[PDB]
């Protein structure tokens, strides 16, 4: 896995897995996007 | 109500001021153009990170750009919070608690309880949640419909 739930989970207590995410948009999505930008050598704006 | 770049000696002095006073939900103006964000564009803060003072810490939804963009503290001038419109009459600075009727809050209890009283810090970008500082847990996220003003 590219990201760890404990690190990116946005709840007031960490979810035990991304499948349990309680946010409207899953916390793993934005995490993967920011991880892919870093892997491409881009900054947060894709620059 | 907020200071501007001209009130400080150095860029880093001003950036520290912006950092201590900015919150999600605030309106800002671009006071120094940066890439896709032109000077004088107006934005609503939608996300704040806390990396180095010169990092891209401030994500806004920008009116003239027509989309989101990350900037640094030095690029923004704080304007203020929008007026209460949630119809909850909860506003920034109010004391709130979780409703007695809530068994488990949407984003979980953390260290908070039904007896906790916290201070509203920000309205979340999604228009449904608030960020609350409780004595037992800072940056606690609540669903507005689960929270109420403390009598
Ligand atoms: S993973 Fe916990 S709220 Fe999203």
CATH code matching the domain that covers B5-80, chosen among 2.40.10.10, 1.10.3720.10, 2.30.30.30, 2.40.50.100: 2.30.30.30
DSSP labels, B9-43: SSHHHHHHHHHHH--TT-EEEESS-BTTB-TT-EE
Q: How far, in Å, CA of B96 to CA of B87, rounded?
A: 15
User: Residue B141 C-alpha to ligand 1 middle, in angstroms?
Assistant: 12
Q: B-chain residues within 8 Å CB-CB of A11?
A: 107-108, 141
Buried b (16+ CB within 10 A) or exposed e, B76-102: bbbeebeeeeeeeebebebebbbeeeb
| Interatomic CA distance for residues A32 and A37, integer angstroms | 9
Way the structure was solved: X-ray
Rounded CA gap, B77 and B33, in Å?
Answer: 12
d(CA B15, CA B73): 5
Q: Where are the beta strands (DSSP E) in chain B?
A: 27-30, 42-48, 58-62, 67-71, 76-80, 95-98, 118-123, 129-134, 137-143, 147-149
* CB–CB contact A11 B112 (8 Å): no
């Amino acid at each position: 896995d590219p990201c760890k739930v404990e690190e990116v989970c946005r709840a007031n207590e960490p979810c035990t897995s991304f499948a349990e995410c309680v946010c409207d948009e899953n916390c793993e999505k934005e995490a993967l996007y920011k991880w892919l930008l870093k892997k491409e050598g881009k900054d947060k704006n894709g620059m | 109500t907020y200071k501007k770049r001209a009130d400080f000696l150095s860029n880093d002095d001003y950036a520290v001021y912006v950092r201590e006073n900015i919150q999600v939900g605030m309106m800002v103006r671009c006071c120094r153009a940066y890439e896709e964000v032109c000077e004088g564009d107006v934005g609503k803060v939608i996300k704040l990170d806390r990396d180095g003072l010169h990092d891209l810490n401030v994500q806004c939804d920008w009116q003239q750009k027509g989309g989101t963009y990350w900037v640094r503290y030095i690029h923004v001038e704080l304007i203020g919070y929008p007026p209460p419109s949630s119809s909850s009459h909860i506003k920034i600075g109010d004391k709130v608690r979780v409703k007695a009727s809530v068994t488990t809050p949407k984003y979980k209890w953390g260290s908070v309880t039904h007896q906790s009283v916290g201070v509203v810090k920000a309205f979340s970008a999604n228009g449904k949640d608030i960020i609350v500082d409780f004595p037992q847990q800072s940056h606690w996220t609540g669903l507005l419909s689960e929270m109420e003003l403390v009598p």
